[model samples]
Target: MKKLQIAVGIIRNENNEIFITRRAADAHMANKLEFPGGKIEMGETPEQAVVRELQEEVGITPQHFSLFEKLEYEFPDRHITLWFWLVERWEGEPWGKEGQPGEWMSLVGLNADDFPPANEPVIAKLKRL
Candidate 1:
């Protein structure tokens, strides 16, 4: 099967808290907490895809960010490569433009034991870093 590639962001606030968004109840990752990004559209670079997703999904424009990591994983049904960026600054407040709830929580406050299974690895890495 062909692998799907996606872009995700680890958006941080001035308080050093990271923003996590809940997937809409109707969406694939329903009720799961995740970073504020989505799939890379065809013909777009990963960075462009992430920036576009940030605006589309959460209504924010990030600045001064860097590509922090890249992750790959598979479930029985699909495989994906996720490019994650660490965004330290952005414009506008994070609102659930996609009809989901957005929460800003400190990395220390994140509980991987309860977050989305796919996100657990990302959170764990954050804790260790």
Candidate 2:
């Protein structure tokens, strides 16, 4: 089985809406709405991973962020360990730089059913904060 170390960023705009995007149709967990992020590369911390991912995927540079939650989830084909980062500040506007659709959505509009099952815990935590 493949194992992945992933870092996801919950980037907030001035209005406190979160930046989110859809997974590529051919990608794993395809079509799911998710926070922008990707696998952690060698020598990268979770923070660095999120920063790099946001820049590449969303065209933004995260200026201020913090680790929110860490969770391990097992899928039939792969096991994933996820780091959720809360990005309070960043430079540049966010868009679907990678050709996937994206938007600034209020936290209240973030439904777990629209995301992968692995993200439920993160949404649960977000609601309380």
lDDT of every predicted structure (CA atoms): 0.82, 0.91
Per-candidate clash tally: 0, 0
Candidate with the greatest TM-score versus the true structure = 2
Q: Pairing residues by index, what is the TM-score of model 1?
A: 0.89
lDDT of 2 by residue, 31-120 (tens): 999999999999998888999999999999987688899999998799999999999888889998988899989987789999999999
Candidate 1 segments exceeding 4 Å error: none
RMSD (CA, Å), candidate 2 to true, equals: 0.9
Model 1, range 23-107, lDDT digits (tens) per residue?
A: 7677666777888888898899998988899999889887778888887888567788888899888888888888778888888
TM-score of each: 0.89, 0.96
How far residue 40's Cα lies from its native spot in candidate 1, in Å, is 0.5
Best by lDDT: 2
